[PDB]
Design a protein around this ligand. Sequence first.
Ligand SMILES: Nc1nc2c([nH]c(=O)n2[C@H]2C[C@H](O)[C@@H](COP(=O)(O)O)O2)c(=O)[nH]1
Ligand SMILES: Nc1nc2c([nH]c(=O)n2[C@H]2C[C@H](O)[C@@H](COP(=O)(O)O)O2)c(=O)[nH]1
Ligand SMILES: [Mn+2]
Ligand SMILES: [Mn+2]
Ligand SMILES: [Mn+2]
Ligand SMILES: [Mn+2]
Ligand SMILES: [Mn+2]
Ligand SMILES: [Mn+2]
Lengths: 156, 156
Amino acid sequence: MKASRLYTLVLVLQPQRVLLGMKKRGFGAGRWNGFGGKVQEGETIEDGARRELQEESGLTVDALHKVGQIVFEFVGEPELMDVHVFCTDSIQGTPVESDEMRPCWFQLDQIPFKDMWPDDSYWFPLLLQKKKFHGYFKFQGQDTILDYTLREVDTV
Amino acid sequence: MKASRLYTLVLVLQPQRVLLGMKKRGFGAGRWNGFGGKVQEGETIEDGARRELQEESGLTVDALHKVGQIVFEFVGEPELMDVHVFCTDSIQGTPVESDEMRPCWFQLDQIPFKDMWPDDSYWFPLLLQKKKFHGYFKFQGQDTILDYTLREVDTV
Ligand SMILES: Nc1nc2c([nH]c(=O)n2[C@H]2C[C@H](O)[C@@H](COP(=O)(O)O)O2)c(=O)[nH]1
Ligand SMILES: Nc1nc2c([nH]c(=O)n2[C@H]2C[C@H](O)[C@@H](COP(=O)(O)O)O2)c(=O)[nH]1
Ligand SMILES: [Mn+2]
Ligand SMILES: [Mn+2]
Ligand SMILES: [Mn+2]
Ligand SMILES: [Mn+2]
Ligand SMILES: [Mn+2]
Ligand SMILES: [Mn+2]
């Protein structure tokens, strides 16, 4: 029994492209990723995801849709990361570079898997198929998966 | 905010009655409650719910569904309890007293609220109406609620 900390992850997925951000600092720096961060006290998970999307990308959205949940365990870290994954296709401003992230659009035949977290290669295809998923990944460091589970679900 | 630990709570709800257990030893001793406990590593939440029901009541479950999620914060404790609440749909066997619980059936107009956790007075009416819910309760000790939120949701 480990304790878990709540995080969000937001993918702006349109019919032919996806918006990712190059992490400029901190956890997972140097990798393309969705936008997100810790959930704060008092806000719902979905509202935390909307807040992190605005802080990191400048984008505001009226609604998000939860598509997945991924639990991350790191060797030597007692706390799990419980990451709630959201999507939207509907935005209405322009992405802005922040201190944390440089946003960039990618065509859906040019997903930069080699420059993303290794677990993304497993669950991102499900997200692109509009399937919902639950995942778990145990990492040694930032590069090496020691154990993982991935399952499609009808409800997250 | 605080990290959380993962728990289940299972209610055997039939059209005419509900099964509760009197806690005999540890946390929440002296109060009627559903059956449940900590979710174990690598175990799905729903599998943890089925396991705890069998251990504490002797009943085996052929079908159950998630009806709610309640987060508990106890003043002075470092972490939250994240409690996933389930109702059974099909059971077999007879309830049996265990070292931790004494099971007893209650008519649905005789819910023993005064001998249950104080938060049950808020969310249990939603469970009885077959409404899905999200709750949060901040406790000072075991008797006093300082703050809470409770909402009906379409999906848990
Ligand atoms: N795609 C992907 N995102 C991750 C992984 N691990 C992980 O913390 N994240 C996300 C969750 C959060 O949005 C973010 C970490 O939060 P910060 O932005 O506060 O560092 O990184 C991962 O393995 N893959
Ligand atoms: N109805 C109700 N159940 C609770 C509350 N707090 C709380 O831990 N529980 C349940 C969750 C767990 O299933 C159980 C405690 O698990 P243990 O058997 O590990 O002590 O008690 C509460 O405030 N109300
Ligand atoms: Mn943040
Ligand atoms: Mn952030
Ligand atoms: Mn971030
Ligand atoms: Mn138990
Ligand atoms: Mn237990
Ligand atoms: Mn128990």
